[PDB]
């Protein structure tokens with residue numbers, strides 16, 4: 001039945017610290033899954049059983065040694081946390097018993113959903129999945145990530161189904177350093193990120209607008225980097241304005257066949273200022289989801305990355321899934337549509353458009369109209 005797909009697996013709940021003081025925990029995917037059923041959207045979507053990702057699948061993004069280290073349970077590089085548990089970092093836990101599996105499952109799930117959508121068996125999909133992936137590098141786990149699920153799906157679409165142009169939109173509040181590195185020289189896949197940057201003083205410290213690509217891939221990496229601190233914080237008004245000026249123009253000109261989304265909900269309301277400190281509303285992610293459904297024919301999947309407040313991620317999930325189904329979205333407050341974006345957001349957008357005009361046609365057409373609000377841009381084009 002041609003519709004919106006979902007992936008979940010309770011086995012992912014097993015990836016927990018051996019002891020809480022961990023923003024990335026089991027109850028994240030669980031409460032999202034309960035929300036989907038409570039609203040009834042799980043009953044409207046087609047569910048798909050997932051699998052562990054084979055080691056060779058993982059080796060399309062990561063080094064052999066890395067894949068062995070955090071993928072296999074046989075029969076060192078581990079650390080003691082300030083909570084008593086085992087980790088590989090001061091941030092990112094490790095369960096010697098249940099982690100390798102759960103991380104490989106998180107990847108495998110976001111290859112089923114992906115291939116099913118891209119193959120024609122489904123319209124589009126949302127993967128309720130943990131641990132996140134976009135921070136995991138070639139040989140380095142970090143930011144709660146072990147394997148870049150989204151980068152693996154992408155690499156496999158290249159190799160199996162042989163898809164020619166792929167587009168990764170990453171809207172987790174942090175930069176996807178992993179996903180960038182994975183394709184930093186590949187022109188066939190466009191990676192564009194929307195992250196709190198603040199001149200490189202925010203995790204993971206990468207993602208300068210300056211960073212555009214190398215070799216054949218130069219100009220196929222777009223870093224919508226938000227500098228300025230939190231005065232005022234970035235909100236709905238600021239992101240919708242970024243999609244309208246940076247994302248959609250570039251993405252449309254690229255015209256991809258598959259759209260992949262590292263959909264972290266760290267940007268929403270109620271997040272402590274170290275974890276995000278942005279004012280995005282859950283309701284808003286719908287419009288961003290909807291705007292991307294216009295691309296590639298609607299061949300789009302969203303993978304859960306970050307987002308830590310339980311109330312926040314459920315809201316933005318149900319909003320995102322409703323958008324993916326084709327439900328009539330709630331109107332964004334008149335307050336929001338009329339609100340102009342702050343001077344910091346405008347400086348950011350303009351710096352990006354400045355660098356990337358050298359690489360895109362429509363960014364050479366106009367002078368900056370980034371300053372306008374939605375209604376003020378809707379009226380000025382009529």
Ligand SMILES: [K+]
Pocket residue numbers: 170171172173174175176193194195
């Ligand atoms: K991002």
Ligand SMILES: [K+]
Pocket residue numbers: 183184185186187189190191213217220221
């Ligand atoms: K690229």
Ligand SMILES: [Zn+2]
Pocket residue numbers: 017018019020021022081083084085
């Ligand atoms: Zn712990």
Ligand SMILES: [Zn+2]
Pocket residue numbers: 172173174264266306307
């Ligand atoms: Zn994040």
